[PDB]
Amino acid sequence: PPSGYGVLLATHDDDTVDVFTSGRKMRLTCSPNIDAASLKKGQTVRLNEALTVVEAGTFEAVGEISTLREILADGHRALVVGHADEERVVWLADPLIPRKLRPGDSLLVDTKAGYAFERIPKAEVEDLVLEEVPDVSYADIGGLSRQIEQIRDAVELPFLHKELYREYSLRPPKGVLLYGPPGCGKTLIAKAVANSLAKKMAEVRGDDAHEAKSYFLNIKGPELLNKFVGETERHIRLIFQRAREKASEGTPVIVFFDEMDSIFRTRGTGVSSDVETTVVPQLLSEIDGVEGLENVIVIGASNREDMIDPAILRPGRLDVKIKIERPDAEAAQDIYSKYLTEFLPVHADDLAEFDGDRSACIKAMIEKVVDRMYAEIDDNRFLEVTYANGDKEVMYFKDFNSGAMIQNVVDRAKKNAIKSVLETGQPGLRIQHLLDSIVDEFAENEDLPNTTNPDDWARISGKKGERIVYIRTLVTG
Amino acid sequence: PPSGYGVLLATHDDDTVDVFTSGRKMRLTCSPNIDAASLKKGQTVRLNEALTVVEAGTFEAVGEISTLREILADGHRALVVGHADEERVVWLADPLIPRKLRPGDSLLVDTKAGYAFERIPKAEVEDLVLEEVPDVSYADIGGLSRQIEQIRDAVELPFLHKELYREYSLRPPKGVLLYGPPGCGKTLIAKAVANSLAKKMAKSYFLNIKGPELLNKFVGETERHIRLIFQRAREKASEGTPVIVFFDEMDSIFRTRGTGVSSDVETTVVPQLLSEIDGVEGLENVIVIGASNREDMIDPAILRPGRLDVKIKIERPDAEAAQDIYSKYLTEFLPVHADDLAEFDGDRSACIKAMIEKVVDRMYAEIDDNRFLEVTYANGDKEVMYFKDFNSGAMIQNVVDRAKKNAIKSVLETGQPGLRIQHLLDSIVDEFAENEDLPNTTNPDDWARISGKKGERIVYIRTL
Amino acid sequence: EVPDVSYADIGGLSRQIEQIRDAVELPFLHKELYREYSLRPPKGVLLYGPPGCGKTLIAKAVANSLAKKMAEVRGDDAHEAKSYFLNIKGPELLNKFVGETERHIRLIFQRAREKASEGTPVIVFFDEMDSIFRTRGTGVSSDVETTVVPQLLSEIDGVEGLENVIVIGASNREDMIDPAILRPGRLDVKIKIERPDAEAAQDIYSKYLTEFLPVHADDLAEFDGDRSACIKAMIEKVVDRMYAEIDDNRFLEVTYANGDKEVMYFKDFNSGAMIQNVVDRAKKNAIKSVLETGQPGLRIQHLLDSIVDEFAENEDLPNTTNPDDWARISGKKGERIVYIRTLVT
């Protein structure tokens, strides 16, 4: 049978309720089947041709998004403004009396019915902060065991043992700063953290899909900056409001500021841009202000620690400072082992001397590669550096080795092996291919040096005691 | 006979549907002729006087158009903004749920019904990000065979047999950086490889963006322009087809993030690009190709292995490369002098080849007739740098154009339809009568690099 | 939520708490004497100093005290008690449209003047007003402050002025603050928060190392179970180690424009936040040891090596002698410092 719908306004003990439909409000009685006490405020009902309330339900449909301004004294009505700066009070529905409401929260309203049904999540945050879960895990990271343990203890440990922390009256750190030379790996650690966080909530909690996406708000560095006044501050405030409302008792929320070395500026610096004076104080007030966050972790990745404002690096805002160093020999071996797995096509001639023991052959190849790469020979001499004292110091390729360089060398060796397979026809991977790839990679970076190169002065001049003033390429030709 | 129309909202297990008609929502029952299972959300339904659905057609093609803001987590609703900044949370029809909708997409909606029917393509967004069809081929480029081989290996091969790469677990290259002296043909190689990849597929898309075009008076516009460019690239590559993004003249924008220019906004533009290449979100089928005659001025963070890992150095053409370029720009169909044609007995190819050989022999000589510059180094040794060390491809093009202009003058003065070898020979020496921007100030960076190659710092430059 | 902190949770600041009480609580506790002497409460309060030294701590402690006073005076409703403290949170007033931030400021101040009842103060706290505080000519990217500052300074004092509203500002860059707003009659009380000394460090450690924290039995063995004596001895040892002129505590070498050389230790760049972080790191080490070995207890060596771990973590953060705190020492020497080098290993 054909029937219409209406919006319930109030319930009375006379078994009669007020329903708004067809643009007018009428007081109608309910069917015997339905229970008056079961009905709630702000939920829809289904009428009939005789106007008999037969079915209940909830309202989920379209509506003009209204900005909530304040909550009245009675607590059941709310003041909202519309697109045309029209202010009006509306009865709050049952599901809004959930997190505590705040001024400026978007609400779904029906002007004719005058009821606010739900809070729409802010669009300026969700459409951008969320990202797809990377495949990188802690297993796929090598040579940074101490850093991995430290970041684990800073992020995941406090929430696994909540009672132990409560007994000592300790709280999780309010900020982590990852820093180091380029290519040593910080976005990889961020990927591992994001993957671990997604795994923790998708299975151990098992709430629903896409919920793991909601956590770990990832924001690129300059993307918050925009051409307006107060827009960046509005974005920051919306981000932190979302983080605060998504942070639960023991459930953490991670805000990752990629490329924090240039966190919108260094305050008191920048001839071309002066946005620091308005963006830095907002972030400084959001973190460790008059009202402080409870279970929100701020993680930043930087390549120039000096270019970050000092007031944000002090303890209480970015507590745990994790430094990633360029790999040494043992770390280089681990990094190579992270890529040269026992599943690559291995040449039969290279396995001839190992009697088919692929793992031993790979280990020996890794050792040979490391020895070649870290050899102190004239072939490995890259640059000479002159300082204020003038002492000419030699710098090899080992001083610029990184996990990215190791991956590039391995990929180039794989490409050379594929070329050999295509041309000659013999399948497999050869150690000589790795050596040729190393030689080509080292020779391809002869044009990198310039008059000045950062990311190494803070590590060289500290021991040397004098600033780098001259750089020369060594014997070539 | 008369029958109305309505908008379907949802289906129920009781074989009942919700229909929006005349600005009101009603509960209806499908007719026995139609099947309730086949119904889809947002589909137009034909009603009758008895308020019974009897037939369902296609979706409405007219109404308002709104800008999409976000997609709600429930997967059945979307927040959009109206013409007057009015915000509506509207249902998504079945067709909406190519690539998934992104913020900024235009949706055909009707506010009273509250449904989004169709994604409406916009010409302005397509025009903002240009996608031309390159036509330059590998044939048009001569004297750079090994560089063409390298760029084929770094681009063409990974997509020719990508299944082999997956078997070998090899990651296709993500960045190629062409560098060298100016005028050596940096853009031609990129255009040629783009055209070859377009012909190879049997579909690809190519994005070309210049340097200064990514500069704005305000702050926060270049970064969002880069973000939009990479979003377009990701949208095009989501289908699996490779996408090439070419940055032209990277020397001007996103220089060294350190001191660099004493007053520049560069410090806030390079990291964004970095975050677009290496980050928590990783692009899959996007290749970034950059060309800059000043490789030392590029940001070392961009030049880190993994981003622009492939590095190709173009060098100034030698005598054989000059002959190749001349052969490329001199065809058999080109008119030649009657005397030369009679000497070669109609063998036009031999005539043009011999003329090219004579021209390239004239250009490369140590005689004091082709003196170009005088260079005095730190040791004080004076050396005459002739044209042999500055034979760029654009210079060859200018030589050919000047020779053709001289041929036009000769044919309009005498009337004989032919081209003389003496025309090109005179154009060789007339090329440097007018500046070609090869000479520069006291201590140029190119001459500093040349001195570093030589081993003694160049201090004095004199025109000859 | 009003912060749970109280004045008893702030250590090393004795004169400053007295001043902040005299500015706010005293005029309303003794209205009769103020009327007799024809004295009115100070119009503005200013807090400044190195970051992490406790400005926001005082700002929230005074808010908690005001909330308690209003609860025990007017009524037990939480909202009315909390409504007498206003939070700005920085550049919240800035808006895209022209002339809207001024309207927001005017609304705020008119509501503040309507709220006061000559016995109930209204407190407006500008958290990190360095954004609004600008010299009207230092702008490079935008000059919205050229419009914001006149409106605020005219609202504060003018032909129509506020009577019993206290404006509290907290800042870290005092130089960037506009000279006009740094005037008697607008910011009467200039409270300066200084980095803790030895006694202040001991007081802060006592505030954080409470006697209720579990202590290892071996530590209590020396004092035979006297928890307070053991804890105070540990605090004394920790503050002695941290405030010691040892070759391992050398931090930075400072060279001025005139050429004077100064050796600065880690104690120079110390704050209450650093002490709290050291205590938290020691507690983290203790709980990790408890998990690994199965025995409870916080030891002294945990504090001793947490100190060196923290000092090593923050051992290298210099940047082209940015005058965050170098201005004062440079003025003492005579010329601004230009050269620095890290003394590590």
Partner: peptide
Amino acid sequence: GSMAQEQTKRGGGGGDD
């Protein structure tokens, strides 16, 4: 050689029903 930030000025607009 400096960047700017924009402040908008809303224009009058009104509709009926």
